[PDB]
Amino acid sequence: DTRPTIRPRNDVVHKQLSAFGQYVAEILPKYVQQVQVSCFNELEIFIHPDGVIPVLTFLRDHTNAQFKSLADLTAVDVPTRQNRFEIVYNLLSLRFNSRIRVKTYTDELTPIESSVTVYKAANWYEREIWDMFGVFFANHPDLRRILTDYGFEGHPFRKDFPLSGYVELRYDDEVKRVVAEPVELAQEFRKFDLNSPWEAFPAYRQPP
Amino acid sequence: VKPIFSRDMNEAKRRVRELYRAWYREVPNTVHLFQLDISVKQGRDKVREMFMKNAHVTDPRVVDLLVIKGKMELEETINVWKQRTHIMRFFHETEAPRPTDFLSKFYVGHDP
Amino acid sequence: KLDITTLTGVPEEHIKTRKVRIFVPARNNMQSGVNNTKKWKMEFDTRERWENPLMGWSSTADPLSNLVLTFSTKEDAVAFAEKNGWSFDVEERKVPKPKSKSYGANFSWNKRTRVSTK
Amino acid sequence: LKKTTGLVGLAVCETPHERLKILYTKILDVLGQIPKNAAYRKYTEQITNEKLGMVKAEPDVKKLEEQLQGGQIEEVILQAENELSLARKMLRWKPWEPLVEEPPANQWKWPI
Amino acid sequence: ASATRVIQLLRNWASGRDLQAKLQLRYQEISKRTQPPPKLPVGPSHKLSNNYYCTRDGRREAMPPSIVMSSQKEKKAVTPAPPIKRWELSKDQPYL
Amino acid sequence: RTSPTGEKVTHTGQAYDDGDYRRVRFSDRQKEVNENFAIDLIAEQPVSEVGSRVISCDGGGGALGHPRVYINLDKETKTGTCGYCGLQFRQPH
Amino acid sequence: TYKFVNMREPSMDMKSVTDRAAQTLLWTELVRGLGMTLSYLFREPATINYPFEKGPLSPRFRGEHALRRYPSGEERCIACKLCEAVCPAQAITIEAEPRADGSRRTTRYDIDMTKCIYCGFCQEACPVDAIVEGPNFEFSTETHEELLYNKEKLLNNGDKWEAEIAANIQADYLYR
Amino acid sequence: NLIEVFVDGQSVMVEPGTTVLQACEKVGMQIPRFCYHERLSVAGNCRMCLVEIEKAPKVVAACAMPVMKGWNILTNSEKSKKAREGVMEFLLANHPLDCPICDQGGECDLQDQSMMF
Ligand code: SF4
Ligand code: SF4
Ligand code: FES
């Protein structure tokens, strides 16, 4: 609609992103599985996990796609899928002033080719993805813990990992050192059931 | 499924043995450098114990991942990225012994 | 078979002693909305919640007391429970029966459905 | 001549036209080593032919830069080198082949 | 400031500027700490007519992302967007 | 009031029993007890009389009170009580 | 639309070269910085004589929490529990029962100041202006346990700072 | 015996005598309702379930109106939205501001349906 409350929609960028998505899909049909353009003008290309290096290198070097900056590299844990981990690449093209997204999938065991050779920024991002989710990146120059504790066990950002973890630290006078002990909370984290029983958005209604 | 480092359990077992040799030959340095108050046997037995915990594993992909995590733990110990607190966390000392007998569990609490 | 238990990092006490339940949550009887009764959910078994001596707050030593995983289908939940070596307990989804409702029955001529007030 | 490209690490090229022509010819050859029906070959050949024609048309460096809209001519040379390397890599990757595998069932469905 | 003329002159000469003009310490130019009560205005939807929420529900006018290509069942080369226009040098202070 | 142990009782009625170890926290210290029991303070307020059949109380101050509610005054046996304020109203009888 | 820092070549005039050599040898810019800090020496220091002088504050200041009462003397808290529900740190713990009068009065209202993020969401969610972050900010304690406030602590706090809390509400409620 | 009706264009086979609300429930649309309960007799007085039938000038009550073959039910059409908003406004016109003190708060059908429709 219109009037101040609604957010204005730009059709020109939508058309341009759709055209470029078709372009990328045509150039790389071996790995591109799906192409979407969100209503707020963000382009997403869905790539088979073997296409990480080819598609990213194309999007970095191609004259019509100079995504020379790796904006972000994250993972999304959806434990309801066979490949729960969803690796997302955020790219920036300073030449054409636009951004693109590349999404792949991987299991808890199947490794993913490391995009360090494509973007040197992907090093610490892949280290963080490994530390937080457990995804292994093959051909990675140095894969190890980056954010968790040194002797930490488990990958916290997984959906099945407890919020408070399994272990806690404290100082013991007997051993003269900080010791890890199973987590016991003085007050339990009060889980809230907040979802309303009524459908909010009819436009996203899944088939019965 | 696509393998990680090995295609057979025999190949995977080879990497486990290589990790064990590295761990076994590191324990004397770990006690010396970290100034641990344990014996070399205790550390080497502890290494054996942690290896024996993951002895039922049969999937080579999981075996490779365990060795990958095993090398990462060794690198922190060699580089002294871990501290004496981290090294001595395997030797649970402040934790009280939790009996595994039913009658003992029944006396303590509602633990199933 | 997937045996990721050795990679999740969960301690042994919370892998074998646990009892995961797989179910579609029942509709909150206080409301007529049914939007929450559409996705399968996975929760663990309730454990001890004692009273904190200082403030009376409900303490706990169960790290998995707040884990509620949502799955699209029963099979995915069962697979995820099998991955981590959790003893699952699946409850079949209950769907309300199709019911024959007629406003005209409120004013029946020779039937008990005739209402006395509106 | 231009004193500096502005960007750090990018040096001024005293012979931009010749270098651009050489790079574009090499790119065209590498694309000629690619199957015709492939979309990458067609698109890149079109782009390279347009750029090479523009390079041959204008001898003025600044006017050529304005016509190319690729920034400074040294950035255009770097883009040509990257395109050549990409073409050489795609010769090995062969992405014109059909899809490796379809996503497994509900792999890209959102929300859950 | 409560600085003598000699001290002010020494300060200005050592600094090389007129410090007594742009003093960092605040004395009286600040706003009063007891301001009069305000009266904020209402938004554009505070009307009693022609204001049904269906005509202004931005949250419900979003749509699932449009699928442009799915593998599941001479074109000109297309850039993601028009190439960025080269920036222009500043006209206030082009070179600092 | 004071519990049998000699410990002041709060407005919620809480008072540590003599057979309760938790009372030892008050040995060298005090027990924080509010001395303005609200239940006693409101009952002190008189019952306002309004001729109208339905009145509305906002707690006083307009926007500095509570959401405006309307109270029925038909029951002659009882007095309409504000849900938030606790103030009582009565139709003259 | 963009500016070049640096990118300024020096003039090689003999006068300019001599001036640069004089700067290098006689340390002119060093003396310039010395004069700058010497000028800063004779300024009036910006220090305030705490605790006899206190820094400026505003009526919107978010400090120690307090449970306010109605002019009648009764608690405003009607145990709606949405202040607890909105608290992003889950610092508020609320238990309620029907009081002897039958009203909605909390039996437990516990906030651990050791977990609160002093966001104000609690005072903004309360529909009766009961929970209010007051103006007090100097309430440091020697023990951890003193920061786990009870309902009695909050009520007492409210009664102590009411005069000021009210004044601040009156000064600011038109913006809310 | 199954007649064919349409909910937002999508075809669905329903038994004769089926109400509009049940036809919409078949495809997954839960029409807002206050008076209608599955296990009670149909009342039709809350008027919250009013929906627009295509090509029809009047909005029927989904809780009571039985479907007729060929009907296309426009659940999210502008007529339905305006009817729901008007009915909710009438319901909330005399409703007391007791939400903080009402025990139904947080699980109240009137609140959620006011938020959604
Ligand atoms: S303090 Fe306010 S928001 Fe919190 S429970 Fe009491 S009345 Fe509700
Ligand atoms: S200030 Fe914020 S964190 Fe603290 S009690 Fe209020 S809502 Fe919770
Ligand atoms: S649900 Fe009330 S009129 Fe149909």
Residue B103's contacts (CB-CB under 8 Å, 6 or more residues apart) are: none
Q: Is G53 annotated as a binding residue?
A: no
Which residue of chain E has the CA closest to D70? Answer: E83
Chain G hits for F45, CB-CB cut-off 8 Å, are 72-73
Contact G144, G114 (CB under 8 A): yes
| Eight-class DSSP state of A50 | G
Q: Is G133 annotated as a binding residue?
A: yes
Chain A hits for B81, CB-CB cut-off 8 Å, are 150
* Cα distances (Å, whole numbers) of residue D8 to A118, A161, E96: 21, 46, 19
Residue H67's contacts (CB-CB under 8 Å, 6 or more residues apart) are: H3, H5, H14, H18, H19, H20, H23, H73
Q: Which stretches of chain C are assigned E, i.e. beta strand?
A: 20-23, 40-43, 68-71, 88-90
Which residue of chain A has the CA closest to E61? Answer: A1
Beta carbons within 10 angstroms of residue D5's beta carbon = 16
Atom of ligand 3 nearest to the CA of H63: 4
**Helix, coil or strand: residue H80:** helix
Any ligand 1 atom below 6 A from CB of G125: yes
* H-helix segments, chain F: 38-44
Cα separation, A160 vs C86, whole angstroms:
12
Which residues contact ligand 2 via a Cβ below 6 A?
G 86-89, 91-92, 111, 116-122, 133
Known binding-site positions of F for Zn(2+): 57, 66, 82, 85
Any ligand 3 atom below 6 A from CB of H33: yes
Q: Chains A, G: CB contacts under 8 A, how many?
A: 4
CA A188 to chain centre: 30
**Helix, coil or strand: residue D41:** helix
Cα separation, G136 vs G119, whole angstroms:
15
Rounded to a whole number, what is the distance in Å from the CA of G34 to chain C's nearest CA?
Answer: 60
Which residue of chain C has the CA closest to B69? Answer: C7
User: For residue D111, is the peptide bond before it cis, meaning its omega torsion is within 30 degrees of 0?
Assistant: yes
Q: Which stretches of H1-116 are assigned E, i.e. beta strand?
A: 3-7, 10-14, 50-53, 59-61, 72-74
Contact D47 A63 (CB under 8 A): yes
**AA letter at F59:** G
* Cα distances (Å, whole numbers) of residue E45 to E38, E53, H83, H92: 21, 9, 20, 19
Q: Could you tell me the distance, in angstroms and rounded to a whole number, from the CA of residue G138 to the centre of ligand 2?
A: 18
How many C-alpha atoms does C102 have within 13 Å on its Cβ side? 12
Q: Could you tell me the distance, in angstroms and rounded to a whole number, from the CA of residue E43 to the centre of ligand 1?
A: 28
Angle of helix D16-32 relative to helix D61-68, nearest 10 degrees, comes to 40
Contact H98 F83 (CB under 8 A): yes
Which residue, judged by its Cα, is nearest atom 8 of ligand 1? Answer: G80
Cα separation, F4 vs C46, whole angstroms:
39
User: For residue G51, is the peptide bond before it cis, meaning its omega torsion is within 30 degrees of 0?
Assistant: yes
Of the bound ligands, which one is closest to the alpha carbon of residue H109?
3
G97 phi, psi to nearest 5 deg: -145, 155
Chain D hits for A83, CB-CB cut-off 8 Å, are 104, 107
Could you tell me the two tokens for C6? 């050795």
Cα separation, C19 vs A122, whole angstroms:
40
Contact C27, C95 (CB under 8 A): no
Which residue, judged by its Cα, is nearest atom 3 of ligand 1? Answer: G126
Which residue, judged by its Cα, is nearest atom 4 of ligand 2? Answer: G116
Of the bound ligands, which one is closest to the alpha carbon of residue H19?
3
Q: Which residues pair with A47 in a beta bridge?
A: A32
Please report the sign of the dihedral spanned by the C-alpha atoms of residue H84, residue H88, residue H90, residue H91: positive
Could you tell me the two tokens for A34? 């799906």
Cα separation, D65 vs D74, whole angstroms:
9
Any ligand 3 atom below 6 A from CB of H60: no
Rounded to a whole number, what is the distance in Å from the CA of A155 to chain B's nearest CA?
Answer: 12
- CA-nearest of A58, A119, A52 to D43 is A58
Would you give the end-to-end CA distance of chain H in angstroms?
35
Q: Could you tell me the distance, in angstroms and rounded to a whole number, from the CA of residue F47 to the centre of ligand 1?
A: 26
Beta carbons within 10 angstroms of residue F21's beta carbon = 8
Cβ contact H–B (≥3 pairs, < 8 Å):
no
* H-helix segments, chain H: 20-27, 78-93, 109-116
Q: Is G109 annotated as a binding residue?
A: yes
Cα separation, G19 vs A177, whole angstroms:
64
Chain G hits for E95, CB-CB cut-off 8 Å, are 3-4, 7-8
Residues 45-104 of G with CB under 8 A from F: 69-76, 78, 99-101, 103-104
**AA letter at E80:** P
| Eight-class DSSP state of G4 | B
Contact D106 C70 (CB under 8 A): no
H or E element at residue B32: helix B9-34
Q: Could you tell me the distance, in angstroms and rounded to a whole number, from the CA of residue A204 to the centre of ligand 3?
A: 25
Which residue, judged by its Cα, is nearest atom 6 of ligand 2? Answer: G122
Rounded to a whole number, what is the distance in Å from the CA of E96 to chain A's nearest CA?
Answer: 25
Which residue, judged by its Cα, is nearest atom 4 of ligand 1? Answer: G83
Instruction: Name residue, tokens 């009068």.
Output: G101
Residue G94's contacts (CB-CB under 8 Å, 6 or more residues apart) are: G79, G81, G83, G84, G106, G108, G109, G110
Of the bound ligands, which one is closest to the alpha carbon of residue F67?
1
Chain C hits for B58, CB-CB cut-off 8 Å, are 3
Contact G122, G83 (CB under 8 A): yes
* Cα distances (Å, whole numbers) of residue F36 to C21, F3, H16: 50, 17, 68
Which residue of chain G has the CA closest to H104? Answer: G80
Contact A56, A48 (CB under 8 A): no
Contact D106 C72 (CB under 8 A): yes
Cα separation, H1 vs H15, whole angstroms:
6
F67 phi, psi to nearest 5 deg: -55, 140
- CA-nearest of F34, G60, H15, H84 to E54 is H84
Contact D43 E86 (CB under 8 A): no
Cα separation, G138 vs A117, whole angstroms:
55
The answer to whether A28 faces chain E, any CB pair under 8 Å, is no
Would you give the end-to-end CA distance of chain B in angstroms?
38
Rounded to a whole number, what is the distance in Å from the CA of A107 to chain B's nearest CA?
Answer: 11
- CA-nearest of C105, B98, F13, H21 to G108 is F13
Cα separation, F54 vs F74, whole angstroms:
9
Contact A160, A79 (CB under 8 A): yes
Cα separation, G91 vs F28, whole angstroms:
28
Contact E24, G67 (CB under 8 A): no
Beta carbons within 10 angstroms of residue G142's beta carbon = 6
Q: Chains C, D: CB contacts under 8 A, how many?
A: 6
Rounded to a whole number, what is the distance in Å from the CA of H36 to chain C's nearest CA?
Answer: 9
**Helix, coil or strand: residue A51:** helix
Contact C81, C42 (CB under 8 A): yes
Cα separation, A145 vs A130, whole angstroms:
8
Kindly provide the resolution of this structure in angstroms, with one decimal.
Answer: 2.9
* Pick from F68, F70, F83: CB nearest H101: F83
Please report the sign of the dihedral spanned by the C-alpha atoms of residue D9, residue D10, residue D14, residue D17: positive
Long-range contacts from G56-63, C-beta under 8 angstroms, 24+ separation: G56/E33, G57/G135, G59/G167, G59/G168, G59/G171, G59/G172, G60/G168, G60/G172, G60/G175, G61/G133, G61/G135, G61/G137, G61/G168, G62/G118, G62/G119, G62/G120, G62/G123, G62/G133, G63/G118, G63/G133, G63/G134, G63/G135, G63/G136, G63/G137
Residue H17's contacts (CB-CB under 8 Å, 6 or more residues apart) are: C100, C102, H66
| Mutation test residue for ligand 1: of G70, G81, G95, G99, the one with most atoms within 8 Å of CB | G81
The answer to whether C57 faces chain A, any CB pair under 8 Å, is yes
Contact F14, G152 (CB under 8 A): no
* Pick from A23, A30, A60: CB nearest D100: A30
The answer to whether F68 faces chain G, any CB pair under 8 Å, is no
Contact H79, H101 (CB under 8 A): no
Method: cryo-EM
